[PDB]
């Protein structure tokens, strides 16, 4: 998958994005060093699909927050398009106020970097990558266009990498087997 | 864009979509009270390789259920002409060789 | 991921697999053309991890059966290793009888052809691929060694691709706007 | 590891000392059953495998990767020791189970 390899640092990106507050910011994956990152791609902005996923991720942002993880959404649209889609209310199809930032991939190099570009129509597949606090990549999930992603599954994954992480801060056990310690016969 | 009274049975809804039943019930509610505060859905109008008339529906996820949970024959919708590449965005390798 | 490209045909392969019955059989991903295949890698055969992951896919093969699907697992270890692992009872730290074929990939090439070989070790990451009845790759998941895959989430994906697959046998609605389609 | 103690000694090793870094996924009914067996017929439950690893500064570190259900049973019974075989091991053996979560053992 692109230049995204498991065990290796995430392919960095800088792009311009819309933030939970509305204003553009100009951010990079590196700003997030020190937190887990859930980085996901969607096809494009004004899908006649009611945007089940992004909304669901924006909606349980707190749960990610307490796992010290940041959720970021990407699509090859301009950030103008993202801004536009955010201000469109959820009743007449739109995203509404996001609790999560939205990256814009107009040159489409991030999609390639992450090996998720549909060459022909030039959009991203439904990709999602988990990167840890040290900027390493832990898991790759890519879906063909018609099938959404599960928030619970993403949480289960983050919680499991963090479970394994946290268990590596361990102190010498101060204990050894010995004849004292044998379980006889 | 003219709003059309399209039959629920005409609409192809090929997307696996898990619905919040609370959202749906709130919509059924509002409908019987104030049907004109509920905006029309968007329906992709696609012509296949021949005469072929197909009308997809991808939005109004919770709005569709609301209308089919009621008895309703038709739902208010805006019609949108579209290519097959338009369609390919939604269905990927599950896009049909429409005729 | 490697050659495996979503929307494009799945990087075919042919290797010796330990079948549910006990016997070897050289097979290929083509042979299941007409069924959705869930194809999954795992690092090693005599793990010190309780193999609860594979046991879970084997245990629940009927769930996949009911969806015209075939779960195949795979590692870099030899086909003789597989045999021996199935012939070691769970409690003695083994697989026991298995309901799903196991591919062997000692050349590390099927791993490579899927982009899931980690060079350092010469073994596969916990990668899993869902391919359709027409042989097309439909979804890719790869996990760093520590974390496992959900059977529930694999079923959920399989069914979802089948749902949209199952539309597209559809045809003209015999309907036309309008009027008397226009709304006041 | 300067030594080795082969080829099959069994030890009563304290649970407080086992690092269990991998997310258990447990069939509860099997856990519930193994509990009955340990209470009443403990010898019929084979000991677990424990990896013993030396830290860079000589620390003892003990990993448990298997017997998932045995371990849990023992946790349900609130024992402070579990029968184990100790298998001396390296760091690089960990990374096989731990990947990028592999700690730098002091």
UniProtKB/Swiss-Prot annotation, chain A:
Residues with the N6-acetyllysine modification: 5, 14, 25, 33, 134
Residue location of crosslink Glycyl lysine isopeptide (Lys-Gly) (interchain with G-Cter in SUMO2): 5, 118
PROSITE patterns listed in its UniProt record: THIOREDOXIN_2
Post-translational modification: Phosphorylated on Thr-88 during the M-phase, which leads to a more than 80% decrease in enzymatic activity. Acetylation increases reducing activity and resistance to superoxidation. Deacetylated by HDAC6 which decreases reducing activity.
Enzyme class: oxidoreductase
Signal peptide: none
Phosphothreonine, modified sites: 88
GO cellular component: cytoplasm; cytosol; extracellular exosome; extracellular space; melanosome; nucleus
Chain positions found as N6-succinyllysine: 33
Other noteworthy facts: The active site is a conserved redox-active cysteine residue, the peroxidatic cysteine (C(P)), which makes the nucleophilic attack on the peroxide substrate. The peroxide oxidizes the C(P)-SH to cysteine sulfenic acid (C(P)-SOH), which then reacts with another cysteine residue, the resolving cysteine (C(R)), to form a disulfide bridge. The disulfide is subsequently reduced by an appropriate electron donor to complete the catalytic cycle. In this typical 2-Cys peroxiredoxin, C(R) is provided by the other dimeric subunit to form an intersubunit disulfide.
Name of the featured protein: Peroxiredoxin-1
Phylogenetic classification of the source organism: Eukaryota, Metazoa, Chordata, Craniata, Vertebrata
UniProtKB/Swiss-Prot annotation, chain B:
N-terminal signal peptide: none
Designated name of the protein: Sulfiredoxin-1
Phosphoprotein keyword on record: yes
Cofactor(s) needed for function: Mg(2+)
One GO molecular-function entry: sulfiredoxin activity
Annotated positions binding ATP: 60-63
Taxonomic lineage: Eukaryota, Metazoa, Chordata, Craniata, Vertebrata
Record key words, sorted: Antioxidant, ATP-binding, Cytoplasm, Disulfide bond, Magnesium, Methylation, Nucleotide-binding, Oxidoreductase, Phosphoprotein
Full-protein positions shown: 39 to 137 of 137
Annotated EC: 1.8.98.2
GO annotation, cellular component aspect: cytoplasm; cytosol; endoplasmic reticulum membrane
Coiled coil: none
Organism domain of life: Eukaryota
Functional description taken from the UniProt entry: Contributes to oxidative stress resistance by reducing cysteine-sulfinic acid formed under exposure to oxidants in the peroxiredoxins PRDX1, PRDX2, PRDX3 and PRDX4. Does not act on PRDX5 or PRDX6. May catalyze the reduction in a multi-step process by acting both as a specific phosphotransferase and a thioltransferase.
Species annotation: Homo sapiens
Tissue: Widely expressed with highest levels in kidney, lung, spleen and thymus.
UniProt record similarity statement: Belongs to the sulfiredoxin family.
Enzyme class: oxidoreductase
Main location: cytoplasm
UniProt record, GO biological process: cellular response to oxidative stress; response to oxidative stress
Catalytic reactions on record: S-hydroxy-S-oxy-L-cysteinyl-[peroxiredoxin] + [protein]-dithiol + ATP = S-hydroxy-L-cysteinyl-[peroxiredoxin] + [protein]-disulfide + ADP + phosphate
Entry's localization field: Cytoplasm
């Amino acid at each position: 998958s692109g230049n995204a390899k498991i065990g290796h640092p995430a392919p960095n990106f800088k792009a311009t994005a819309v933030m939970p507050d509305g204003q553009f910011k100009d951010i990079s994956l590196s700003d997030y060093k020190g937190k887990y990152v859930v980085f996901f791609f969607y096809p494009l902005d004004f899908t006649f699909v009611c945007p089940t996923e992004i909304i669901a991720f924006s909606d349980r942002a707190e749960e990610f927050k307490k796992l010290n993880s940041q959720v970021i959404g990407a699509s090859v649209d301009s950030h103008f398009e993202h801004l536009a889609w955010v201000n469109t209310p959820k009743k007449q199809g739109g995203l509404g106020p996001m609790n999560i930032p939205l990256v814009s991939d107009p040159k489409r190099t991030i999609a390639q970097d992450y090996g998720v570009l549909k060459a022909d129509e030039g959009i991203s597949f439904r990709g999602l990558f988990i990167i840890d606090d040290k900027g390493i990549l832990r898991q790759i999930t890519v879906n063909d266009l018609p099938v959404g992603r599960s928030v619970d599954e993403t949480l289960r994954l983050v919680q499991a990498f963090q479970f394994t992480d946290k268990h590596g801060e361990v102190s010498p056990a101060g204990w050894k087997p010995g004849s004292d310690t044998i379980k006889p016969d | 864009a003219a709003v059309h009274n399209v039959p629920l049975s005409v609409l192809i809804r090929p997307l696996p979509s898990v619905l919040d039943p609370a959202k749906v019930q709130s919509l059924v509610d509002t409908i019987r009270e104030d049907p004109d505060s509920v905006p029309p859905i968007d329906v992709l109008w696609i012509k296949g390789a021949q005469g072929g008339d197909y009308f997809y529906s991808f939005g109004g996820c919770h709005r569709y259920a609301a209308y089919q949970q009621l008895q309703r024959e038709t739902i208010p919708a805006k019609l949108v002409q579209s290519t097959l590449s338009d369609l390919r965005v939604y269905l990927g390798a599950s896009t049909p060789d429409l005729q």
